[PDB]
Amino acid sequence: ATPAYDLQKRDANNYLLTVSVPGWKEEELEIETVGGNLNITGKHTEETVEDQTHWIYRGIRKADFQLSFSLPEHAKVNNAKLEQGLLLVEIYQEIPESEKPKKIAI
Amino acid sequence: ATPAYDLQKRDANNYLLTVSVPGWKEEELEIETVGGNLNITGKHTEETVEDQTHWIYRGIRKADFQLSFSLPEHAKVNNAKLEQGLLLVEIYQEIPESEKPKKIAI
Amino acid sequence: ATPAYDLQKRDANNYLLTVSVPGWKEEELEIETVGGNLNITGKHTEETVEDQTHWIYRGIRKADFQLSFSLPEHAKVNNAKLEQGLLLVEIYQEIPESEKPKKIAI
Amino acid sequence: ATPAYDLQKRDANNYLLTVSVPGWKEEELEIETVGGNLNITGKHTEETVEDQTHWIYRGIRKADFQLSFSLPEHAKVNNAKLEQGLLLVEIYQEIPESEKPKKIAI
Amino acid sequence: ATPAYDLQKRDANNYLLTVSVPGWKEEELEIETVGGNLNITGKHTEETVEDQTHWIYRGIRKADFQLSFSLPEHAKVNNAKLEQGLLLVEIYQEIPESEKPKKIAI
Amino acid sequence: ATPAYDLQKRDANNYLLTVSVPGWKEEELEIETVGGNLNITGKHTEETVEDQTHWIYRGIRKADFQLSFSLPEHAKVNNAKLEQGLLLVEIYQEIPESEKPKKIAI
Amino acid sequence: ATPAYDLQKRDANNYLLTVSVPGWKEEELEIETVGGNLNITGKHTEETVEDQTHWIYRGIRKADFQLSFSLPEHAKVNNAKLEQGLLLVEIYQEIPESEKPKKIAI
Amino acid sequence: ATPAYDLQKRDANNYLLTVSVPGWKEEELEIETVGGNLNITGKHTEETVEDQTHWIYRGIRKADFQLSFSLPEHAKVNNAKLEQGLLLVEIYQEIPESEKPKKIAI
Amino acid sequence: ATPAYDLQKRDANNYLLTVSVPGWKEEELEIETVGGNLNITGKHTEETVEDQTHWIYRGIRKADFQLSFSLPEHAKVNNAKLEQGLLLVEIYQEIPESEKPKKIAI
Amino acid sequence: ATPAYDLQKRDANNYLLTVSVPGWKEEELEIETVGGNLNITGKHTEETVEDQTHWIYRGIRKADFQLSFSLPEHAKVNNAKLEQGLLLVEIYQEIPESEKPKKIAI
Amino acid sequence: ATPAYDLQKRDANNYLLTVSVPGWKEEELEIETVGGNLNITGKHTEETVEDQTHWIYRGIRKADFQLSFSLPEHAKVNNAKLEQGLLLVEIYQEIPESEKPKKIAI
Amino acid sequence: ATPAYDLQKRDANNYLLTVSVPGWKEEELEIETVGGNLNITGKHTEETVEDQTHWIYRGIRKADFQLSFSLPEHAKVNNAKLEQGLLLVEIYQEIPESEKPKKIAI
Amino acid sequence: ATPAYDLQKRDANNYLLTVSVPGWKEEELEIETVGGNLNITGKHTEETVEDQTHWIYRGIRKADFQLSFSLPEHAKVNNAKLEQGLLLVEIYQEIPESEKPKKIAI
Amino acid sequence: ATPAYDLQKRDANNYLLTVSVPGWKEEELEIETVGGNLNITGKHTEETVEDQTHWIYRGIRKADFQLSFSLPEHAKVNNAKLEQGLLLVEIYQEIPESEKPKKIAI
Amino acid sequence: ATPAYDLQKRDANNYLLTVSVPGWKEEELEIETVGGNLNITGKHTEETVEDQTHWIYRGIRKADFQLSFSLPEHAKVNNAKLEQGLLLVEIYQEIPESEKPKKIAI
Amino acid sequence: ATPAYDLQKRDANNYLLTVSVPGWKEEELEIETVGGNLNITGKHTEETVEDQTHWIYRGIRKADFQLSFSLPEHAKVNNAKLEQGLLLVEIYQEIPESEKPKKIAI
Amino acid sequence: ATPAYDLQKRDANNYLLTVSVPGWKEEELEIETVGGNLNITGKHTEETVEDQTHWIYRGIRKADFQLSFSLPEHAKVNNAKLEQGLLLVEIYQEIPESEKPKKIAI
Amino acid sequence: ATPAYDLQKRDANNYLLTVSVPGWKEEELEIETVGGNLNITGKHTEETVEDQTHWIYRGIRKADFQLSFSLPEHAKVNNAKLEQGLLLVEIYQEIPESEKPKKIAI
Amino acid sequence: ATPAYDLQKRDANNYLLTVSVPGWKEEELEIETVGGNLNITGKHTEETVEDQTHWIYRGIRKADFQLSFSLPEHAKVNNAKLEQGLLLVEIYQEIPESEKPKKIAI
C-alpha cells in the first residue's frame, strides 16, 4: 500500500511532486538524492502496543515505504514543505536551449 | 471516492474518530449535529481550471462529500483537531450507571 | 409497478415527500397515519370497459397501491397538495435538542 | 430516460396522444409542426443547484427531450390540454372517402 | 393465439383471404374498412359458466382478436362467406395499366 | 400436424368429442368402430396442383390422418354433427349400476 | 396447489383416505362416485372483497379443486367425517377369496 | 416442515393470526407469552409405531415445532379459537394517541 | 441385435406379422403360444469353427433371440410361411360385435 | 437396500422366485396373500446394541422390508423353502385351455 | 438404408459375397459386369399404395439401390444363388503363378 | 437454390439485370409485368426420370422458381436477350425533370 | 472506411451536410443529383509509387468512395464549399404548408 | 478461530452461556460489562519459545480473542465457573410483566 | 469459386461432362489432354475498367480456373459443344472385354 | 462382483469373519492358509445349460472368486460354519502381553 | 466430529499426547491398551432430553468416539491427567541403544 | 478520440509529420518545443450551445488534446503548413557524419 | 522451501547424502540420530536488522528446517564434510548375507 502521489510541471524548469502522508512526521521522513535518482522514504520509527480492545475499527493504513524516481540530468531541488498532510517538493532543472514554441505556415 | 477513516474508543464513555483529509482547508470543512446524528460534510469551496497538459500525473483524489452516523443518547462533542492532514474528533458520553468489568466463581 | 417518489429535508424539522401520480384524482387517493407509520394509498375506484379496438398503443401504466413509511416520533404533517401531477406532502417534527453545528480545533 | 406515452384513436378521423409529464410547467414545454411531422420538445427552463445532502432520495427523473412522429396528410391539431400532470393531445383528420365497415355473404 | 390464415391472388384484380374460425358465428364477427386498412375482428359475445367438472380435456382454444392489413389503393371487397368453418373474403382492385406479360430477344 | 380436439363429458353415461376441421368436406371424412375402439380417419379425397406464385401465403395446414381411442364397454355412438367447421361426436353409455354422489358423517 | 393427502389400509377390506382441508366447510365439499371412480371436489362458494389494506401477510392458500381416484371393483364407502380440519373417508371392499397368509418349508 | 400462516390486521389496535393446524389436538398445543414476545409451540404428545406396509402413501406431515414473534408494547391476547383445523389468534392493542387518517390541500 | 419386424391388419379379424430372418432355417425356428402370449424363438443349433483366415469381412449379424407379444383374447393363428427370407404369420380373432363404421349428421 | 431376487418360470403353469436372504431367521420372515397379490415382508424381530469399536468393518446390510407383486388369477402357492440362505418360492397355475406351441407352412 | 453384406474368400483364386435381401424378388434384381467392376443394382419393380392405417408398424425397410466394386483382373463369376432371402455370389480367379505358403530357417 | 443475379444501371433512366440461367430453354421461361412489379418465373416444363446409376455426379442444380421486384413508375421494358446461358434484361425510364450533377463553391 | 459526416437543419427549408475530407482536392470530388437522390463521390485520380522505404508510419487512410442519400421532394442545393478540410453542402426545400408551432389548453 | 459457544434459557429471568476454553487459565480470561454489552476476552499472557523440534504434530489451536454480545436491559450476572474446560456464565434479568402462558377457545 | 459440373455415363464406352459457364466465350476456353489427364481451362482474356458507379449490385461471380481429371486409358473425346451456357463434352473409351451383365441361380 | 463381508473382534484373541454366500455349497468352497495369509476361495464346480427361455428375470449374481487377507502372527483358526447362507469363521491369536486397559490422573 | 489433538515428543524415549475434551467427565472416558496399540474411547454415559426451545444456540458438539494408534515396542504409559478440560497422556520408551546426535568432518 | 496521423521521412536528416485536423482553426492550435520534445496541443477556443434537435446526426468528433514526441538532438523545425484540413510539419536534422549506404563482397 | 538433496549408493554398505546449503555455517547445522531415524536440522542462529534500503534485489532464500529420514537397521555414519557449499554425509551398514549377483541358464 503506497501513499497517493501527483506530478505537475510549473515550467520547463520545474517539477512539483505532491504526496499524501497523513500522520507522517518530521522525524519519520527521510529523502536522498543518489545517482540522478530521488528516493523518498517513510519509516514508522517504532511500534506501540496497540490495544485491539481499545479500537473497534480502522480504515486508514500506513506502511513503511520507499519511492524511487529517475531524475533528468541535471536536477536541483527547490523546497519541500509538509502542510495539511501534504508533502510538496519543488524541483528545478532546464536549458535544453529550447523553451521556444513557434510556427504558422501555408 | 470516500476517505479512509479510523474510530478509536478510549473508554466506556468515550470514542475517537480519525479521518484522513490531505489538502483540505478548514475553510472547506463543515460539521453538523442533527437528531443525535453526526454529519461530516466536506466541501471544496471552489475549483480552478488546470491544464492537464501541465499536470503529468494525478493519483490524488478531490471530491465534495457527506458522512452520517447515528449516535446513541446522550452525545456531546469534545474536540475536533486537524493536524498534518488528519481530523481527530473527540466524543465523550455514557450513563447507564454500569461500568462493572469483573467476576469468576466455581 | 409503483409511482416515482423523492424525499427532501427542508430542515431538521422538515421532511417533504414528492410522488408522481399522473391521472390520479381527489377521490382516488386516501392516506392514513397509524402507529407512527404513514400510509399513502391509491385506488382506481372502478373499471370502464376499455375498447381495445379504440386504443392502438399504451405506454403509461397505473396500478392500485399502498406505500408505508415508518415515521420518527413524534411527527406532524403540514400540507399535501396535488399540482401538476405531483403529490407534495409536508411533514414536521423536531427538537432532539441538537440543531447545532459547531467546532474547530488544533 | 423518456416519458411513458399512450395513444388513443377515437375514430377513423381522430386519434389522441396521452403523455405523462409530472412537475412540468407549460413554460417548460414547446411543440412544433414541421412537414406533416409533430415534434414535442420538453425543455427544463433552468436548474437550481440543490445540495444532495438535503435530498435523501431521488426516484423521480428530470430531463430535456424531443419526440418525433410523421403524420399522414392532412393533419390538424385540435387541442392539447394539461391536467394533473398529463398532456392530452387531440388530433383529427382523414378523407379517403371510405369509412365503410360492413359485409357478409354465402 | 391467432386463427390460421392464407392469401391467394385470383388475378391482378383479386386477393382472396381464407381464415379458419371454427365455432365462430354470424354475430361474433365484425369487420371494418378504415383508412385503406381492413380490420377483421372477433369477439366472444359473452361468458358462460363452464363447469370444469363437466369437461376433462380441451385442446381447442379461441380468443377475441383483431387482424389489420394495409390495403393497396384503391380496393374493393367482393364477397365474404362463412362455410365449413372457413371465412372466405373476396377483394377487388386493379389497373396499374400493366397486366401485360411479354418478351423474347436474342 | 394434427387437429386440436376437445372432449366434454355431459354425464356418467355420456361424453362429447369436439374436433376442429375447417375446409373439410364430409366427403373427405370417414369414421370406424372396431373392437370397442373409435378410429377417426380424415382423407383429403384429391389434390389440385396450385401454383405457389398465385399463393402468396399459407398459414393453414391440410393433411390426411387417423386418430384412435379405446372405449370401455359397452359403447354406442349417438350423433356426429358438423357445423361451421366443427365435428361434435355424441357418445352415450354406462351401467355399473352405481351413480351415487353423496355422504358426510362425524 | 392441492391439499395434503394420505392412504392407509385398515385391512384387505379397508382403505382410509385422510385429506387436510383447513377452512373447508360442510357446504364447500361435494363428492361423487362415478364409473368405479371416486371424485372429491372442493369449491369456494363465492368471493368476498378482501381488503388488501386489511391483511399484511398470508402464507395459507386454498384453491378450488377436484381429486379423482380409480376404485377397485366393487367398492363401498363406510363413513366420511370432517374433524380437526381433517377429512377422513372410510371405504370397504374385499373377498378375492384370499386373505390367507401362510407358509414354511425346507 | 413449518405450517403455513396468515396474519390479518383488523384495525390500528388489532391484528389476527391464522394458522393451519390439521390433525392437531388442543392437548398437543402450548402457547407462551414471554417478554412481549409470543411463542407458539406445537408438541405431538406421543407417537405410535405404524407399520409402513399398512400405510401406502403419506403426503401429510407431522412435526413438533416452535414459532417466535416480538410484539410491540403493550400487548394483550383476546382469544385463540380452533375450528375445523385452524387456529385464529386475536391480538388487540395500541395507544400512541394517534389514529388520524386525513388531509389534502393546494 | 433383433431381426426387422412389421405388423399389418388385414381386417378386424386379422393380424399379419412379417419378420426378416435371412439364413434362418426350418429347424432353427420354434414358436410357442402360452398364456395369451405368442413367442417366436430363434436358435443357432450349433457352432462351426469359423476360419477368421477364411473371411476378410462380415457385415451381416445373426443372434439367437426370443420375441414375445401379448395377444388379445381369444386369438387363433392361420398360417406361417418362410419364403424369400421372410417369416409371414397369419393370425385370426374378432367379434367385439362392432365391425360397423357409420355416421353423418347436421 | 433391497435384496437381489431371481424369478424362474418352469412352465406355462409355473414360475419360481429366488431370493437371497442371508442371516435371516424364519422367525424374522412373514408372507401374505392379499387380492391375488403376494407381499413378502421381512422383519428383523429385534436388534442388539453392538459397540462399533468391537466391529471393525461392515459390508453386510440388515433392514426390514416389504415386496409386492400382482399375480394373475388364479394363483396358488406350492412351497417356499429356505436353504443355505436362499428362499425358493414355488408358484403353480394357469388355465386358458391353450398351451399349443406349433406351426409352419408355405 | 443399405443392406448388410458379408464377403468370404474360399481360396487364393476364389472369394464369396453374402448379401441379405429379404422380400426381394429375382424379378426385382439386376447385376452388371462393367470394366472389371461389379455393380449390383436392386430395383423394386413397382409399389402399391398401402394405407398406413392398416399398417400399425414398420421396422422393415424397402429401397432401390446400387453397389460397386472394382475387381482385379481377370474376373469371372461362377454362380449367384438366392436362398431363404440371401444372395450368395461365387467369384473365382487368379494367376500370378504364386500360391506358396511356406518357410522357416535359423 | 436461387440463381445468382447482377443488376447494372447504365444511366439515370436505365438499369440492366443480368441473370445466370444455364441449361434453360426459352420454352422453360415466363416473365410477367403486374402493378409496376416485375415477376420472373422459371418453369422447367417437364422432367425425365434418370437412373442415378447412370449419373455418377451432380453439382448442377435444376428448380422451378419465381422472383419479384417493385419497380418505380413509370416503367417500360426494352429487351430481354438470352445468350450463352445469360439473360440480360433492359429497363429504361425516369422523368423527375432533374439529372443535374454539378456544383462547388467557397 | 468512410469519411466522418454530420447533418444539421438550419430550418424546415434547410439541410446542411458536413463531411471530413482531408487531402481531398477540387478535381477529386464529383457529385450528382439523380432520381431524387444525392450522390457524393470521391476518387483518387491516380497512383504514385509510394516508397515504403520513405515512410515509417501512416495512421491516416483515404479510400475512393460514394455516398448516396435519398432526398425529399422537391429539393434544391444552395452551396458547397471546401474549407479547412471540410465539405459543407447547403440544401433547400420546404413548404408542407406547416411551419407553424402552436398550442396551449386546459 | 473462535472457541465453541452455546446459549440456553433457564427461564425468562435466565440466560446461560457455555464456552469451550481448553488450556485457558484464571489469569488468562478477563470480562467486562460496558454499555449494556458483555465482553468476554481471552489473552495468552506471553510467548514461550516453542521448539518445533520438540513437537511433531498439533491439531489444537488457541488464539487471543474478544466476544461481544448485546445484553437486554437491565441485566445482572449470577456466576461464572470454569470447570472441565468449560466456562459457564449465569445471567439474570426479567419482569416484562408477562411470564404468563395462557389460552384455549372455540 | 468453381463452375458447377456433372458427369453421366451414356454407356461403358461413354462419359459426358456438363459444366455451367455463363458468359464464357469461344476465345475464353482452352482445353488440353496431357498424360492421360484432361484439363479444362478458363481465362478472362483481359480487364475492363468497371465503373463501380455504374453497377449497384452483382451476385454473379466468374474467375479464371483450371480443372484436371484423370482419364482411364485409353480415352478418346467425341465432341464439345457450348450451348445455352452449357459446356457439353463427349468422351469415348471401352472394351474391358466385359460389357456383359448376366446371372440367376438357385 | 464380490460377496458381502464383515469383521468383528470378540476379544484381543479373536477375529470373526462373516461372509454372505447364498447358494454356496460344501464342495464349492475351499480355503487355504499360506504364508501368514488366509485365502477364501469360491468355485462354481461346473456349468449347466441354462435355458434363457426358462428364466425371465435374474437379479442375483454369483461369481467364482478368491479373497486374501494378511493375518497377524501368529494366528489360529477356531471354527468355520455355514448356516443360513452365512460363512462364519472364528480366528484366534493373542498375547502382546498387553490386554490391560488402565489409568486416571490429575 | 472428532476432537482436535496435539502430540508432543519430549525426548527419544518419550512423547506426550494433548487432547481437547471440554465438558467430559472422567466417568465418560475409557482407555485401552491392546497389541501395542492405544485405543482412546469416549463414551457419553447417558443423555437427557433437552427442549430445543429452551436452547437458543448450540455451537458445541457432543459425541461418543474411538481413536486408534499403533505404538512401536515396547510401550508403557506414564500418566494421563485431565486439567481444565484437557487430557495430557504421558508415553515413555525406547531402547535401540542409540541416541547419538553428533558429527562433522572435512 | 485522437486524430489519425502519418509520419514521412524524406531523408536521413529529415522527416515529415502529417496530421488530419478538419474544422480546426489556426486560432485553435498551439505547438511547443520543450527539451528536444515536440508537443502539439489542440485547443478548441470556445464552444457554442447547439440544440441537438436542430442536429439530426453527428459522426464528426471535436475535442481538445495534447500529443508528445521525444526528438533526438539536435532538432530544428522547418515549416508547419495547414492546407485543406491537413497539418504538414517539416523536421530537418542529423549529423553523425555517416550517411553511407553501400557495400557487397565475396 | 527446502534445500536441494541427492542420495547415491557407493555399495550395499553405503549411502551418501548430498545437500546444498549455501551460506550455512558450522554453528548453524546440527544433526541427530534417534530411533533409527536421521535428522538434519538447520537454524539461523539470529536475526540482523536488514536494511531493505540497502538491498534492491534478493533471489536467494534460506529458511530454518529439519529433514527426517528412516534409516535401515543397523546403520553407521562414516563422515560429514561441508565443502563448496555442499553437505556430504557418508553412511555405512550392510550384511544381509547377500551381496552376490549371479545366474545364467537355458
Short mmCIF file of N, CA and C in Angstrom, two decimals, chain A residues 39-92:
data_model
loop_
_atom_site.label_atom_id
_atom_site.label_comp_id
_atom_site.label_asym_id
_atom_site.label_seq_id
_atom_site.Cartn_x
_atom_site.Cartn_y
_atom_site.Cartn_z
N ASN A 39 15.01 9.45 -3.97
CA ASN A 39 14.31 8.48 -3.14
C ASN A 39 13.62 9.14 -1.95
N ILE A 40 12.32 8.91 -1.82
CA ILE A 40 11.53 9.46 -0.72
C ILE A 40 11.14 8.30 0.19
N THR A 41 11.65 8.29 1.42
CA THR A 41 11.49 7.13 2.29
C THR A 41 10.80 7.40 3.62
N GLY A 42 9.64 6.77 3.79
CA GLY A 42 8.98 6.68 5.08
C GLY A 42 9.36 5.49 5.94
N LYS A 43 9.51 5.77 7.23
CA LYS A 43 9.72 4.80 8.30
C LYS A 43 8.93 5.11 9.56
N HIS A 44 8.07 4.18 9.98
CA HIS A 44 7.48 4.28 11.30
C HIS A 44 8.64 3.97 12.23
N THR A 45 8.96 4.90 13.12
CA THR A 45 10.17 4.81 13.92
C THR A 45 10.15 3.62 14.88
N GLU A 46 8.95 3.18 15.24
CA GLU A 46 8.78 2.25 16.35
C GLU A 46 7.34 1.79 16.46
N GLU A 47 7.12 0.81 17.32
CA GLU A 47 5.82 0.21 17.50
C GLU A 47 5.31 0.57 18.87
N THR A 48 4.00 0.53 19.01
CA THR A 48 3.35 0.88 20.25
C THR A 48 2.38 -0.25 20.43
N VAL A 49 2.33 -0.84 21.63
CA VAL A 49 1.40 -1.93 21.82
C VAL A 49 0.06 -1.28 21.58
N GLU A 50 -0.70 -1.83 20.65
CA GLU A 50 -1.95 -1.21 20.31
C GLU A 50 -3.00 -2.12 20.90
N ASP A 51 -3.86 -1.55 21.72
CA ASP A 51 -4.87 -2.39 22.31
C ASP A 51 -5.95 -2.57 21.27
N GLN A 52 -6.11 -3.82 20.83
CA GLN A 52 -7.12 -4.16 19.85
C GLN A 52 -8.48 -4.14 20.55
N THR A 53 -8.43 -4.12 21.88
CA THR A 53 -9.58 -3.87 22.74
C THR A 53 -9.99 -2.40 22.69
N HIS A 54 -9.01 -1.52 22.51
CA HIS A 54 -9.21 -0.08 22.53
C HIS A 54 -9.88 0.43 21.24
N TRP A 55 -9.51 -0.14 20.09
CA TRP A 55 -10.10 0.27 18.81
C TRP A 55 -11.05 -0.75 18.17
N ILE A 56 -12.29 -0.35 17.90
CA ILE A 56 -13.23 -1.24 17.20
C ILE A 56 -13.00 -1.24 15.69
N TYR A 57 -12.66 -0.09 15.10
CA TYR A 57 -12.48 -0.04 13.65
C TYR A 57 -11.38 0.90 13.16
N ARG A 58 -10.64 0.42 12.16
CA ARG A 58 -9.63 1.20 11.44
C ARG A 58 -9.79 1.04 9.93
N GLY A 59 -10.01 2.15 9.22
CA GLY A 59 -9.97 2.11 7.76
C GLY A 59 -8.69 2.68 7.16
N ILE A 60 -7.89 3.37 7.98
CA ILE A 60 -6.71 4.07 7.49
C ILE A 60 -5.43 3.29 7.75
N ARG A 61 -4.73 2.93 6.68
CA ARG A 61 -3.48 2.18 6.77
C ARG A 61 -2.25 3.00 6.38
N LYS A 62 -1.17 2.86 7.15
CA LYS A 62 0.12 3.45 6.78
C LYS A 62 1.15 2.35 6.87
N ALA A 63 2.13 2.39 5.98
CA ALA A 63 3.17 1.36 5.92
C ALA A 63 4.50 2.03 5.64
N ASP A 64 5.59 1.46 6.13
CA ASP A 64 6.91 1.95 5.75
C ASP A 64 7.15 1.70 4.27
N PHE A 65 7.80 2.66 3.61
CA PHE A 65 7.94 2.56 2.16
C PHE A 65 9.09 3.38 1.63
N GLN A 66 9.49 3.09 0.39
CA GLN A 66 10.44 3.94 -0.31
C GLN A 66 10.00 4.11 -1.75
N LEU A 67 10.08 5.34 -2.23
CA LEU A 67 9.74 5.66 -3.60
C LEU A 67 11.03 6.06 -4.31
N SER A 68 11.15 5.70 -5.58
CA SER A 68 12.36 5.95 -6.36
C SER A 68 11.93 6.59 -7.66
N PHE A 69 12.57 7.68 -8.07
CA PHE A 69 12.20 8.22 -9.37
C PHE A 69 13.45 8.75 -10.08
N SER A 70 13.65 8.30 -11.32
CA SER A 70 14.77 8.74 -12.14
C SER A 70 14.65 10.22 -12.49
N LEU A 71 15.70 10.98 -12.19
CA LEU A 71 15.71 12.42 -12.40
C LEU A 71 16.54 12.79 -13.63
N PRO A 72 15.97 13.62 -14.51
CA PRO A 72 16.73 14.09 -15.68
C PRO A 72 17.93 14.94 -15.26
N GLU A 73 19.08 14.69 -15.88
CA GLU A 73 20.27 15.50 -15.63
C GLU A 73 20.07 16.90 -16.22
N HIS A 74 20.36 17.94 -15.45
CA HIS A 74 20.99 17.80 -14.14
C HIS A 74 20.16 18.58 -13.12
N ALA A 75 19.51 17.86 -12.21
CA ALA A 75 18.37 18.40 -11.47
C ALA A 75 18.72 19.03 -10.13
N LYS A 76 17.95 20.05 -9.75
CA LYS A 76 18.10 20.70 -8.46
C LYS A 76 16.75 20.85 -7.76
N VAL A 77 16.72 20.55 -6.47
CA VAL A 77 15.50 20.64 -5.67
C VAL A 77 15.37 22.00 -4.99
N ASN A 78 14.20 22.63 -5.14
CA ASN A 78 13.98 23.94 -4.55
C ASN A 78 13.55 23.86 -3.08
N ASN A 79 12.33 23.39 -2.82
CA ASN A 79 11.86 23.25 -1.44
C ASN A 79 10.94 22.05 -1.20
N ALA A 80 10.90 21.57 0.04
CA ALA A 80 9.95 20.53 0.45
C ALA A 80 9.19 20.92 1.71
N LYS A 81 7.88 21.15 1.57
CA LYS A 81 7.09 21.56 2.72
C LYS A 81 5.97 20.58 3.04
N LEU A 82 5.85 20.24 4.32
CA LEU A 82 4.78 19.38 4.78
C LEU A 82 3.74 20.26 5.45
N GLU A 83 2.58 20.36 4.80
CA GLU A 83 1.49 21.21 5.25
C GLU A 83 0.16 20.54 4.95
N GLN A 84 -0.75 20.52 5.92
CA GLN A 84 -2.08 19.94 5.71
C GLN A 84 -1.97 18.49 5.20
N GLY A 85 -1.03 17.75 5.78
CA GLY A 85 -0.87 16.34 5.44
C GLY A 85 -0.31 16.14 4.05
N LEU A 86 0.27 17.20 3.51
CA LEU A 86 0.77 17.17 2.15
C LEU A 86 2.27 17.34 2.12
N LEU A 87 2.92 16.56 1.27
CA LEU A 87 4.34 16.73 1.02
C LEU A 87 4.47 17.39 -0.34
N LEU A 88 4.98 18.61 -0.35
CA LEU A 88 5.16 19.34 -1.59
C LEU A 88 6.65 19.49 -1.87
N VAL A 89 7.15 18.91 -2.97
CA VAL A 89 8.57 19.05 -3.26
C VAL A 89 8.79 19.70 -4.62
N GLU A 90 9.48 20.84 -4.55
CA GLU A 90 9.81 21.70 -5.68
C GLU A 90 11.16 21.27 -6.27
N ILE A 91 11.19 21.00 -7.57
CA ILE A 91 12.44 20.58 -8.23
C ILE A 91 12.75 21.37 -9.52
N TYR A 92 13.97 21.90 -9.62
CA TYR A 92 14.36 22.74 -10.75
C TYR A 92 15.48 22.13 -11.61
#
